[PDB]
């Protein structure tokens with residue numbers, strides 16, 4: 217499919233690498249640092265490599281009007297949701313320390329210029345841009361200027377729209393990933409359109425391609441690995457009985473383990489060429505291919521024909537079924553017994 | 565991807581249809597009709613639509629040489645294995661009756677001319693050609709002459725080799741499916757090469773494409789549905805404690821149910837276009853897109869610039885973040901308050 221790669225710290229990312237699962241705890245901690253640590257713990261214990269946060273600073277990321285608009289998966293204002301779940305800088309720093317104290321990579325999504333500038337002071341290894349901010353070219357310009365790689369969610373945007381963000385990233389010269397995404401919480405299967413992944417890499421050949429997902433299970437993310445995705449992102453929780461607008465479409469430690477397992481299998485099985493010769497198939501070839509046999513007794517000097525020849529397993533005959541017809545017209549040099557393979561010495 | 569379809573009895577098969585799972589009991593019944601019925605039962609009870617058999621007639625399908633060649637997943641001759649598992653015509657007829665008495669479609673794989681002629685007397689709705697016989701053009705010629713659709717496994721064969729079989733099928737004018745396949749029992753993930761599916765449909769645009777599989781689990785078959793497969797075939801057993809050379813890579817009633825479930829989900833999620841507009845995304849668009857706001861107080865008659873403008877959620881502003889730069893140079897008609905959206909009445 218392709219050979220693009222870049223590193224997030226020490227982790228190589230790309231088609232020829234192990235697909236990377238981003239556990240976004242996001243606002244699932246409900247603004248509690250203690251809950252965020254329990255979620256980071258569940259992710260460590262499940263084998264996660266990367267915890268992603270959301271860096272919310274309510275005054276810089278929304279104007280007064282956001283206190284009157286309700287998101288689709290909640291019933292209060294988006295302003296109220298972020299004032300309730302936002303971690304301040306002192307605690308977000310503690311989150312990053314904790315995540316790395318558990319051996320894992322911390323990245324986050326900035327929603328504002330102030331949030332973007334806070335993460336650069338923390339010196340995170342790479343930056344996630346969410347689907348809302350995929351058309352936020354002034355913000356993309358700022359993050360790309362930090363010189364880290366950029367993982368850009370691409371939901372709710374067209375190729376034409378994304379191309380303007382991608383020109384900005386290329387200009388800064390940082391490597392980048394494009395994540396196909398659908399921003400309904402949760403997302404019906406029929407709205408995933410995994411074909412959108414091929415569309416994205418056909419439109420931008422230099423990009424790592426993966427999927428951000430908000431369906432109820434793993435099927436979409438597994439399908440994306442089969443298609444060549446290198447990065448899979450689901451929301452993450454320690455347990456499903458947590459409160460919060462994104463908990464519903466999150467994975468828990470067990471389903472992460474399923475996803476990590478399917479991702480590994482499909483990383484091996486995907487791709488390749490039809491025509492490749494698999495050495496392990498040879499004993500099956502040798503016994504199951506057909507060889508040309510006599511279909512009846514054939515007298516010395518009689519002509520071989522489609523009436524006195526046929527084909528039978530196994531494959532060690534002098535003439536393969538591929539050469540069946542080239543024996544027509546040839547003359548019997550011996551008496552040939554019915555059911556015997558046609559040997560070269562059976563014809564003049 | 566494509567729009568090809570044909571029917572197996574009453575079941576429509578193709579990309580725009582529900583993917584079809586073939587439960588091949590094969591030689592798992594170990595030659596026992598009573599065991600074959602227990603396997604047909606487990607398949608009915610699990611929700612199967614199609615039971616596939618293998619139609620073995622040891623004298624017509626192999627010569628004397630097959631009593632000296634051992635298949636890779638066993639330790640006796642292929643001749644011995646088939647003499648032990650082969651159902652005679654009286655019992656194979658009873659199998660087909662039973663399978664249809666349970667509401668299901670019976671198809672089988674012929675391995676010989678006699679086997680092919682037995683199935684036409686039974687008047688099966690479609691024919692499976694296994695990977696061993698994919699280069700058996702004289703046998704393919706005979707089966708295609710029966711006028712039923714043909715599902716052709718394509719393991720251990722190149723595109724160039726398959727093309728000769730496909731010319732034969734097209735000539736008879738029956739619709740056909742191509743199944744990508746790897747004939748190692750069982751098959752490591754790394755040998756599946758799911759890309760071979762795209763290769764097959766790129767080489768033959770009129771064919772239904774699916775996968776025949778012999779890996780240990782469902783990951784491959786799920787990946788094939790994500791890629792657009794319409795037909796999935798695994799070996800089938802009622803329980804895993806059965807004896808036999810193919811039991812190992814078979815599915816049981818539970819894992820079939822998993823596969824049928826993943827197949828249904830990935831049938832919905834696969835395909836589509838990136839640029840499609842998902843109506844359900846609109847509330848997220850309205851709250852998460854940014855609008856141009858004043859970044860500082862701006863005096864009446866001052867010029868708007870990248871220093872006094874910025875962008876903030878939500879999306880109901882007069883100017884989208886897409887129009888951010890077109891506001892540069894415009895003149896303030898009012899006093900504009902810091903943090904307020906730029907309204908059209910704020911500029912001359």
Ligand SMILES: CC(=O)N[C@H](C=O)[C@@H](O)[C@H](O)[C@H](O)CO
Nearest residue numbers: 242287289290346348461462852
């Ligand atoms: C558009 C957007 O930013 N969506 C976020 C996911 O990345 C969500 O986590 C929202 O913050 C959340 O669903 C609001 O209820």
Ligand SMILES: CC(=O)N[C@H](C=O)[C@@H](O)[C@H](O)[C@H](O)CO
Nearest residue numbers: 504590635637638694696809810
């Ligand atoms: C090449 C071939 O015919 N393989 C069959 C599957 O379709 C197997 O079921 C074999 O009959 C079996 O594995 C022999 O041990």
Ligand SMILES: [Mn+2]
Nearest residue numbers: 240428430451
């Ligand atoms: Mn998300």
Ligand SMILES: [Mn+2]
Nearest residue numbers: 588776778799
């Ligand atoms: Mn098989």
